[PDB]
Design a protein around this ligand. Structure first.
Ligand SMILES: *[C@@H]1O[C@H](CO)[C@@H](O)[C@H](O)[C@H]1NC(C)=O
Ligand SMILES: *[C@@H]1O[C@H](CO)[C@@H](O)[C@H](O)[C@H]1NC(C)=O
Ligand SMILES: *[C@@H]1O[C@H](CO)[C@@H](O)[C@H](O)[C@H]1NC(C)=O
Ligand SMILES: *[C@@H]1O[C@H](CO)[C@@H](O)[C@H](O)[C@H]1NC(C)=O
Ligand SMILES: [Cu+2]
Ligand SMILES: [Cu+2]
Ligand SMILES: [Mn+2]
Ligand SMILES: [Mn+2]
Ligand SMILES: [Xe]
Ligand SMILES: [Xe]
Ligand SMILES: [Xe]
Ligand SMILES: [Xe]
Lengths: 642, 642
């Protein structure tokens, strides 16, 4: 019943807590769990299990990152035999994911800190309605290596929208290990933006409302087209596994599509997730220079996954999957409605109207039903709606949509005509600067296109000029396909030259002889605007290209490095690929960076309408012909479906 | 009841036919109507009519392009008084949109032409199962200016999928005025691809089918959220007018959004349509060198609009709008279900989960209902699904999706290993080359952002390096806004440098002082790969940039020129902008070129799954704040049961 790639259960978190506590009792040890996740089973074992799932036995192994007595420990546990197989101290740079508990403690410190109390009083602000939040500080060339954060504070009072009410102008640094403020500098007095009209909760808003949106009700006469057996999904011609990890968030594994013509299930994607985020702000002053969050490695995408609100975050009749996370003391926490799965209707699958045959009317239009797997991750002010969409046609469409709250920098300025220098953002409301920033996400995409042995092909589009009278045309374009030999050949800056980027299996061809493959259709690319030598850009060097390909390696999981808080950037994707390994006809992995540059506008305030992005992974000579040529539209059914 | 921008009614087409026949009787004149459309009412009159629609009287004026006795006539008619106001002969280069009737005659010619009959017999093909199609030939520097086309032929037999069964290797040129074949060269014998498994009609396919897709049934308890009064749509906070023209196809006009905070209807888009298409093939041999269709100007997007199939091309409960087109003799033809309007559910409008306030759980997620207006244009083998999507948030999202059939070049080659030279396409099936080609579409977007006096702003994102020790950061980015002064400043190649492109009203600002505007968020851009001096690229010079801005001019409607068939490219958007007019704080128009490079894959055969493209027009300081801050989700209703 339990699949080897399943997320950790309540029971497994408790056994981990127990096994680690046994070695390090809380009576004589300060013990904090900062990561508890499944140690990836060896791929060859997983592939053996797939073909004989009743026979192949894989032990559940757990990787744990724990701070014990102010030292970072890496602990591997075999849960079958309830033993610790290894326990090593991390000696390199960087620190684990911040825990929720230590943040909850850190944000109370300013409220009892006499210099903060005096700064607050001098501004005439109500101390009892201040909330603070912990921001990571990264690394800026210093040799000092301590677990410090910056604490920023905000007014609440008549609104819960705290992020639009900063108390701007105060430096507070807190050491999380010591749990105390180690630096304080009250620099500038800035007005706190009003609470008026910042409220986003319907219960706290007043009329008028509008425009009115008409309701819709719907029903599937034969129920859902997908079945979830534990974490294993069967839907239409697809099978895949839904996993979940406290750091990565959602993980799509073992994605295979049934080829009706060949009567065989065929692998596309062994493993797909978001490996890291990078959200660099563009305000170089003391107020914000340090704010370039790596959400996944600094806060945990899984740890920060929210409960989906039925009928809103997912359509009605969506099916929900609960997951478990853990707290700092190792206790499992139920995360209700962490993921949902639903079907989407209305799309045209394909069509043709034929009018070229005299005296014949021919038309055919068919519709598709698509599958969406959705999860939502909220880190502080940003909400990220993460979707994986599957289509019978074989396309997979990973998408990310952004909402939430702008990070506001407070200012005395009320109108644009008062601005006399670069504010490093747009004035989106009185006293409110929306600071310029980027969102970069990098996907790990372990394609095993019809098997593990794959290659990466760049199909360049090139212009040929005809000068020799051999045609009336002066020009045309044609393709020129190059196989990337090493990792340096697969570092692509999209938009420099026209090309299709394809992962193929060179060992498997269609009957006419084309290598089977999948191609990336990207959205308009964001490129880094920081300099390559800037400290946050070194740490976020995984954003240096839009696409990368590496040789598959178990231990290469996290693009910003295993330890991201205060990282020096000596363990990123950029660093790994300096080895310049061979990537021809072997197990390879694609990494794809997506992102936007955010120039805030007034529409983003006080809460922001969804901005949707997407890319498509499209079968490209994977099938002999259109895989949905023989796929029928869903039947028409008169309301109410009986 | 009749709005000035309404499409031509049956009655109006008949009056036009009558008026023109009365001056040019068919007893003494050869008369063909190639275009009959609404002569655009003057803008200042239309704006006056909007404010007083019961009082302002605009005469319906009709523009007609007719070939009369082998001369092209331009005829303007005032229908109120049933008179011809002007009748001028076109003396320049190029010819009108091909009529359906003359093509029907032209495609029969090969079947009675003894050299074709002999060429067909020599290949052993069944003459009674051959169908031919007329292809435009453009212009390639020759001084000759006649209405010729290339005729290509196809086998039918056990399939209606003719385009995948070419008879390749025969040149046939026919003069449409003379209605005869004026050139014939049988060059090469190529195998005709098999009919086997080319069928896309469900009634002509055999098992097995799959995967099974589950049905859905739906109902709106309070009916549709939109009303259509004639051609004027009211939905949510939008009003706009749906028009139709035999050349352009669908036209969206007078799009205004109600701003609840200001209690006022505010203009965004005066007029939006697809002005031209350009589909250059990349085979320079005698077989295809000439094939670079300008769909709209050569065949008519409106004339080529198909009837939408209920429940397939549009979801159930969509509302349909009939239009009229015309035949060559000027008779109105009813086009049932030419356009549909429906509402789309499921999207998150915005959300936030707040976890930063100790001991408080705060979450809010709202959904939006969006509006889709759809039409489908099929020219030969290509099907284009054209959508205009409106959102309560103010975004407009025009989209184009592509399906239909590949244009196949027949060949004796069965496997890729047999290929010894550039075939100018991919081998997608035995004997079947899918020839490389592009699709370029150009949109006319007459934004009148909260009024007619607008400017075009390029907000460049620039990297600044800090060297002088004033920050721990080495770098950041900021914005630099430049207003385009003249047309040369507004010719944008997207992807060269990072920037937001915004149309603003410089005379209207938000209370905090930002200019009201709308911004373009484009898809990954296609750029021309023909040389600029190639004959098709001169004719299609409107594709030379992704974005253009011109001063509003009534007569500048068609980006490839008024007369496209055999054009020399002396009347394109590129030519008009050599005037380099001023475009600061005045009535301006944006043109946006969208497109793809199509490298055919086997999945595209024998009929192709939908490839969807889109861009967003997003309000950018247009509103004081998030316009849907106070918009409530549609109410949830439980399935009633049985
Ligand atoms: C400060 O805030 C508290 C609520 O947390 C309120 O009871 C009190 O009256 C406030 N003080 C002032 C000066 O407004
Ligand atoms: C896997 O990658 C890491 C470095 O990123 C390295 O320590 C290890 O040797 C690699 N293993 C292989 C098989 O190359
Ligand atoms: C040619 O096709 C017709 C049907 O259009 C059929 O009746 C006839 O027998 C065919 N002849 C050959 C040579 O197959
Ligand atoms: C309006 O457009 C036409 C065609 O491009 C041109 O001949 C005319 O001069 C234009 N008006 C101005 C003032 O540019
Ligand atoms: Cu942002
Ligand atoms: Cu195409
Ligand atoms: Mn792989
Ligand atoms: Mn305008
Ligand atoms: Xe995004
Ligand atoms: Xe890919
Ligand atoms: Xe498209
Ligand atoms: Xe725009």
């Amino acid at each position: 019943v339990q699949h080897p790639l399943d997320p950790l259960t309540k029971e497994e978190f408790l056994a981990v807590q127990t096994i680690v506590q046994n070695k390090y009792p809380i009576s004589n040890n300060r013990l904090a769990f900062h990561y508890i996740g499944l140690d990836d089973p060896e791929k060859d074992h997983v592939l053996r299990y797939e073909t004989h799932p009743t026979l192949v036995s894989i032990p559940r192994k757990i990787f744990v990152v724990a701070i014990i007595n102010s030292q970072t420990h890496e602990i591997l546990i075999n849960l079958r035999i309830r033993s610790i197989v290894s326990d090593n101290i991390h000696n390199g740079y960087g620190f684990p994911i911040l825990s929720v508990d230590e943040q909850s403690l850190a944000i109370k410190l300013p409220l009892k800190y006499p210099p903060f109390i005096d700064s607050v009083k001098k501004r005439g602000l109500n101390l009892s309605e201040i909330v603070c939040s912990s921001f990571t500080m990264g690394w800026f060339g210093e040799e000092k290596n301590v677990r410090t954060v910056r604490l920023d504070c905000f007014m609440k009072e008549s609104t819960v929208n705290i992020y639009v009410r900063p108390i701007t102008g105060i430096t507070i640094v807190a050491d999380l290990d010591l749990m105390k403020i180690v630096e304080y500098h009250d620099r500038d007095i800035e007005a706190v933006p009003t609470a008026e009209n910042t409220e986003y909760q319907v219960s706290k808003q007043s009329p008028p409302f509008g425009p009115k949106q008409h309701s819709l009700t719907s029903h599937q006469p034969q129920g859902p087209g997908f079945q979830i057996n534990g974490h294993s999904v069967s839907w239409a011609n697809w099978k895949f596994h839904i996993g979940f990890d406290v750091r990565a968030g959602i993980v799509i594994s073992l994605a295979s599509i049934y080829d009706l013509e060949k009567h065989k299930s065929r692998r596309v994607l062994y493993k797909g997730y978001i490996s890291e985020l990078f959200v660099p702000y563009q305000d170089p002053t003391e107020e914000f220079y340090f704010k370039t969050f790596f959400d996944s490695g600094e806060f945990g995408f899984g740890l920060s996954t929210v409960s989906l609100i039925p009928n809103r975050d997912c359509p009605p009749h969506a099916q929900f999957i609960d997951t478990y996370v853990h707290s700092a003391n190792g206790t499992p926490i139920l995360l209700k409605n962490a993921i949902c799965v639903f079907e989407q209707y209305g799309n045209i699958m394909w069509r043709h109207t034929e009018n070229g045959i005299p005296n014949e009317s021919i038309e055919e239009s068919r519709t598709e039903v698509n599958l969406i797997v959705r999860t939502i991750v909220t880190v502080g002010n940003y909400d990220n709606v993460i979707d994986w969409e599957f289509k019978a046609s074989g396309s997979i469409k990973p998408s990310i949509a952004l909402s939430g709250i702008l990070e506001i920098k407070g200012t005395n300025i009320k109108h644009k005509d008062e601005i006399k220098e670069d504010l490093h953002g747009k004035l989106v409301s009185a006293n409110s600067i929306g600071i310029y920033h980027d969102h970069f996400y990098i996907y790990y995409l372990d394609f095993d296109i019809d098997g593990t042995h794959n290659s990466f092909e760049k199909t360049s589009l090139k212009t040929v000029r005809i000068k020799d009278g051999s045609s009336k045309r002066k020009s045309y374009w044609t393709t020129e396909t190059q196989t990337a030999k090493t990792e340096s050949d697969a570092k692509i800056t999209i938009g420099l030259a026209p090309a299709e980027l394809v992962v193929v299996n060179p060992n498997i061809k269609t009957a006419v002889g084309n290598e089977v493959g999948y191609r990336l259709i990207p959205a308009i690319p964001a490129h880094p605007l920081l300099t390559e030598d800037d400290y946050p850009q070194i740490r976020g060097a995984f954003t240096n290209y839009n696409v990368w390909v590496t040789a598959y390696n178990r231990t290469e999981k996290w693009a910003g490095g295993l330890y991201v808080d205060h990282s020096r950037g000596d363990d990123t994707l950029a660093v790994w690929t300096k080895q310049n390994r061979e990537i021809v006809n072997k197990d390879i992995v694609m990494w794809h960076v997506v992102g936007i540059h955010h120039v805030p506008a007034q529409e983003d305030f006080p809460i922001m309408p969804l901005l949707s992005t997407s890319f498509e992974l499209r079968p490209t000579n994977f099938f002999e012909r259109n895989p949905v040529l023989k796929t029928l539209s869903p039947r028409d059914v008169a309301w109410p479906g009986c």
